[PDB]
Amino acid sequence: DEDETTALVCDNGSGLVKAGFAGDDAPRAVFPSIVGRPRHQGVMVGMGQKDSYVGDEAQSKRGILTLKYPIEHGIITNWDDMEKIWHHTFYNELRVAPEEHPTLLTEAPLNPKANREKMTQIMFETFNVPAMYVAIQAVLSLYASGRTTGIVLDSGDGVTHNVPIYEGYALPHAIMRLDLAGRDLTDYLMKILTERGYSFVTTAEREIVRDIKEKLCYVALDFENEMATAASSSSLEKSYELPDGQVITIGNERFRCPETLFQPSFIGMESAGIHETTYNSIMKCDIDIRKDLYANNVMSGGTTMYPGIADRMQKEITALAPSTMKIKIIAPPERKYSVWIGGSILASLSTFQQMWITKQEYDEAGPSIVHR
């Protein structure tokens, strides 16, 4: 129990932090990855002067603060502001004292060696956690779907990745990163919806375009004869009621937004798209392992939640793969937390105890120890 209860799992994202206790089924804490700094001197009624704001209080009060994102494209870019988000996570969100809890953290696919050593330096030397561990994100997603070999298409708020994993070892030279994700996708909907003849003028109009994207957006299979369908004008249309009455209608654009993930050309991106990239990762891997990867395309991440994403991907890679092959696109329902759940499982596991980096290992080996 000492640490059975006690292991923490913190998944640091570009848009959201997911956090909680190893053992739980889902994150106890989910909140924006921002750190707000007040543009002016003054106070809220009853509070003192605050130097900084994190998560939702930074989002809610955004009009008087300069908002900053510590993690650009999955990589920690500002370490002063990240230690601020961690502090908030332990002390306010989970309300635990960190110096008696083992902490499993996550990093990104080709996270620079030096960063994995730096967050270890900050975990052990400024938070004084007993022990910690850094798992790679795609690797926890795979594992949370039971398996050990497969290829994960991972897509969240600032990055998309393909991480081919074989008997647990993520394959460095076959990993692909596509910098277009849910953030890019909300801003494109924004324009095709103002372009539908609308105005997201006040900040209460801006924010909810993102809630339109999440609730009403679709990834149609045969996106071709779906536009064609749009035109005959079926009961395909969908009206959403705004903060007030102002019933906005979205028929068609509803799927023009996730067609951006297959066609980056919709947004002036010259890069290849999700399905081709799944494939290219795969023809960059060893030959003998390619049947395995093909029957185990595990999807994880908030942006892979658009319904019919899996069917489109299913047919997208069948028709690029040699017919002798078995294609299989696994997309679980909890996928917006796969990464986290994979960490919860792993860290609560009976056999993981012997991989925890302890302060004994650290004080004796330097940050190098956990770096592997």
Added chain:
Amino acid sequence: DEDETTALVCDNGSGLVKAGFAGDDAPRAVFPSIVGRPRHQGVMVGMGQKDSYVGDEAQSKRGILTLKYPIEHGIITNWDDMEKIWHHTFYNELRVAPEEHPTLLTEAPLNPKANREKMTQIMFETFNVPAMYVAIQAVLSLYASGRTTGIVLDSGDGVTHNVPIYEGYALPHAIMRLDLAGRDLTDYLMKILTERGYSFVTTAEREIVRDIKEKLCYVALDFENEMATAASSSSLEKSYELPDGQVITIGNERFRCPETLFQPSFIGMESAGIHETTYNSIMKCDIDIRKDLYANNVMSGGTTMYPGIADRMQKEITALAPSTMKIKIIAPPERKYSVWIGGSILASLSTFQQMWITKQEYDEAGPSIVHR
């Protein structure tokens, strides 16, 4: 007690001064904002030659003096004559010595920086008050209705304003000023009542048109089919008995006077009216704060006291606002003193002590100190 008893609250208006002690429920002193200067040399029986007259003695003796209004449209226009009204307030009306009383004063919505510094220069350097503070009027009105975010429609004797306030900070760029108020409104009634076939000939006829406006005037909802009602001639009519017998009847015009506040066109004004202006203030503010402002339209000022003002405004902005919105027009009964009461509360408060500008701050920082 030193200053718990001792804080003064002086609300300077275009028509009236409201004054008294922080702590009280209502102003100890209310009187016209005039300064009379005798047109001829001579005396009243038993008095000496008087150079000047202020408040009610200036009104009562108006036939031999040239009357002057120091505050034009809420802004202090003559500083020689204002120091005269302050002097009168402290020494004669409240009969206090100012050099041992902290003084909370009020200013108008976009009061020029230089004025807030000038009345501070006169408070500290010619009245020698221990400490003082200048609150913005709409902001004290809001606060006296308990809240901190809302939009105040403030309307008195020379100005009308809309001041959107968010967690206490009045929003400069969303404030609207409409120069038509109770003064304009008494003169319009005057004409629609002489136009009813009457004569307000002597000064005892002039003054009481204003007491007709206050007692008998109404703001009808559906001002349309209220004129229509007037015609069928119901028992809608209302006769007032003059200083003498001369029973004057006012049926209809009774509401044609406050319909001027929604239709400025009744008086050759091309500006928009109260309700549209409430609204425009609101579509000039941030988007995310517009649901707050809509559910918190606080009314203050002598001219917002016309019964049924709130119902007309209620329906005036519901029908301009998106139906998804909650409208809420708060109009308290003490509203002709909201501003003052908000100051009484605030200045008698336990936490306000640390915002008082003291002579220590001033003698050391210059007028800049209180200016903020």
Added chain:
Amino acid sequence: LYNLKERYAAWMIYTYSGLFCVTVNPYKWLPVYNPKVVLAYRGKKRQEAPPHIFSISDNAYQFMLTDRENQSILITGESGAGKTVNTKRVIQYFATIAASGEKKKEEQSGKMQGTLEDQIISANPLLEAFGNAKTVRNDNSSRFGKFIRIHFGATGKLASADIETYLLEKSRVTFQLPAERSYHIFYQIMSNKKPELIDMLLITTNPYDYHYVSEGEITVPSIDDQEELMATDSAIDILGFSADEKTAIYKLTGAVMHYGNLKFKQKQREEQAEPDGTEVADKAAYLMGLNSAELLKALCYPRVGVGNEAVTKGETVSEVHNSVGALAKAVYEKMFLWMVIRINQQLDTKQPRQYFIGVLDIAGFEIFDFNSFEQLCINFTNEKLQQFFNHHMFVLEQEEYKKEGIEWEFIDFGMDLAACIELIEKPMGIFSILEEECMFPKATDTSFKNKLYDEHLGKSNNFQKPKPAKGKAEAHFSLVHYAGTVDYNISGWLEKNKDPLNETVIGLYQKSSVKTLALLFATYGGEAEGGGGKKGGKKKGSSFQTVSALFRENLNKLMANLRSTHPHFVRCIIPNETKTPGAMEHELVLHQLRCNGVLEGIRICRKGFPSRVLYADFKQRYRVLNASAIPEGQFMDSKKASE
């Protein structure tokens, strides 16, 4: 720790620790308060006699006439330390050793109403019935603080007295912990020694009929409610109260019981409160000189005044029950205050006064896993009191090194605490932020909280964010007091600090047939002018703006009175939670010592030249060393001697 302990196991309760006069609860009887002792300690410096309270108390007197300065005695300790006992005992002392009403001295209804020396005394037993109760620690715990000014004459004979009350435990009136009980009075009255009373008040003799007063315990073996009732009764009289008033008091004390019996129910299809009967209201109404109806309306349909008018507001069941309770408490309090005033009034004589001796009885810094508003107020009081000492000592010390000719320079010892005090009492400090927000019609505890931080956090050292775990219950803010770190919970503060009362009802009181009740409310009725419309400042009309606004004013008026005084200190101690004579838990006594000031006086002593002997205390004990030449020195000049 060890010295105290040893002389206790030997049954010596009075040991000095510098200037202090430590006192340990015997938990049994002692011939110390002995009428022989009283004399013995009469005219003796504390070096001419062993450690004892009369030493302090006599010296004060002495000093009083010798130096022509006023004096003070500061008694302080935890709930079970037994201060009242001392306080009282000190008081008798004064009365005895300097009375002489000449005519009042005879054995003819001696000490009955009609003399002060008695009034002076009789005072206690009234206050005690109303401001005292069975605590889980004491059986007669003081639930309030107090300050008496014994105004001595020119000659040196008694002339006047002056009481002042601080921080009364209003909550007992409505609540009570399981092992505790409410004020005595209630139980006194229902005891049945004066049966008329029961019928007069319209109550029963079974407390379980009055929820407000039987939530905890009803009977205490060591107390004879029947005897006290008279004590109380008789005291009132002596105190000069009018029968009527003496009738108001009673009648008023029963109304309050009744209130807690007032019941309500939800109006059908409405969320409004509607009276669940006019059985009790009737009694409460009559007893207060009210009208049942008018009363139940005001209660149910509170008619407010938002804007420039008076808007009738409807309340919920939960809202009523709570408002009632608020008046119950409000009324009791006020009354209590009044009684004190009335007492003071009798204790007012025309004879000249040249000096006084103040006896202050209040609580000491107590730390709980749960520290709320009340704790701050008390702690703050103590942290002040402490600085008050640290200074007196600095002043004092420095005289010696000046008298002797030593060359020691040092900074005021008070200074160390100024940091904490400023943070609380200064303008942008806690109280202010607390009392400002109270002006915001739509503020939250949460609101207040943030304001507290944004402004003090990171910028102030004594200011800190809590340590939520250990024996503590939640988080908000810790302070760094001299005694240590106190973790404060801010929840209810805003309210508690606003003293919200249904003004409609108060209205009724204000026009009662029961003058006294009417009186008690006057000061509320006279400030309403000032807070006429919604929002604003109550102070405009003389109404309190803060729960804390006075406390401060009173605490200032006090600490000022304390200054024009020659401070004399007394620290009361509590041996063991278990109530056993001759015993002591260590850490329990250790605690007190830190929060007492005792350990801080030792510190300041040790900076340096630890042990410091008072001259007579020096003569006596050591004359024998060069017997001839040391005795001559000590006798020839109390000081020059030791030299």
